[PDB]
């Protein structure tokens, strides 16, 4: 049985299996078993690069978003979120007052990579990442792998927006 705040890796999120079994294998060993510390979902992407988490998004993970000149006597939002047993954060990150403005036009762009911005170039605005070739996908490759240097087993992450 997994400890409280722990579940078998790969368990369903709706019912995180806290109990598993091991068996005397034919080679004289036992079946492998583990209980990961659970992992709540990451905070919303709009706060990327702004919150620091104690141990990632695990159970009872304390993620604090950095804000300035936001007094606690006003009682607006919460800057700290803690992951719970069920797989949820006890609090929610709130947008502070010191986040406003527009964004620069993406002049630096690849020949195939186009950015369509019906929402202008505001801060927090979503710009769709499209390609001139209809069968081309806008992705980020790891810094150690270039466009030609993609291994057959590598699966680059898809970037549908910026």
């Amino acid at each position: 049985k997994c400890k409280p705040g722990y579940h078998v890796p790969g368990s369903s999120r709706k019912s995180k299996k806290r109990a598993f079994k091991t068996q005397c294998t034919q080679d004289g060993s036992w079946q492998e078993g583990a209980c990961v510390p659970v992992t709540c979902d990451p905070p919303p992407p709009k706060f990327h690069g702004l919150y620091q988490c104690t141990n990632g998004f695990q159970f009872n993970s304390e993620c604090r978003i950095k804000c300035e000149d936001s007094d606690a006597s006003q009682g607006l939002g919460s800057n700290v979120i803690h992951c719970r047993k069920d797989g949820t954060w006890n609090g929610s990150f709130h947008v502070c007052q010191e986040m406003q403005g527009q964004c620069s036009v993406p002049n630096e762009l690849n020949s195939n990579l186009k950015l369509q911005c019906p929402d202008g170039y505001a801060i927090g605005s979503e710009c769709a990442t499209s390609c001139l070739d209809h069968n081309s996908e806008s992705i980020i490759l790891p810094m150690n792998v270039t466009v030609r240097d993609i291994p057959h087993w590598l699966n680059p992450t898809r970037v549908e927006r910026v």
Side-chain angles (χ1 to χ4, degrees), residues 43-44 46-47 51 63-65 78-81 91-95:
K46 54 194 177 185
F47 310 120
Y51 54 85
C63 297
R64 300 204 164 185
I65 187 168
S78 185
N79 272 342
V80 192
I81 65 172
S92 62
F93 283 149
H94 76 273
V95 176

Side-chain angles (χ1 to χ4, degrees), residues 23-95:
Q23 176 264 348
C24 177
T25 63
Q26 199 59 259
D27 72 329
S29 87
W30 287 99
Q31 284 185 332
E32 289 84 0
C35 289
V36 289
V38 192
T39 297
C40 286
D41 63 358
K46 54 194 177 185
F47 310 120
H48 60 257
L50 205 51
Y51 54 85
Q52 287 186 342
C53 296
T54 47
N55 49 353
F57 324 120
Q58 287 188 350
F59 161 77
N60 276 356
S61 176
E62 174 160 356
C63 297
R64 300 204 164 185
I65 187 168
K66 296 195 174 185
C67 282
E68 293 167 314
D69 300 331
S70 69
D71 288 322
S73 69
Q74 294 195 3
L76 72 165
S78 185
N79 272 342
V80 192
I81 65 172
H82 303 108
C83 169
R84 302 293 91 219
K85 166 192 171 180
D86 54 349
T88 62
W89 299 93
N90 75 331
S92 62
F93 283 149
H94 76 273
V95 176

Side-chain angles (χ1 to χ4, degrees), residues 113-154:
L113 173 62
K114 300 287 97 175
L115 290 187
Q116 309 313 96
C117 301
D119 311 316
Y121 305 114
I123 279 173
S125 77
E126 181 267 332
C127 282
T129 76
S130 76
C131 313
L132 293 179
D133 183 65
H134 292 357
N135 264 342
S136 279
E137 301 188 43
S138 61
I139 50 183
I140 297 169
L141 275 166
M143 295 296 172
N144 300 301
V145 161
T146 76
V147 183
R148 189 259 173 275
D149 296 333
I150 307 173
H152 67 104
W153 48 263
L154 175 60

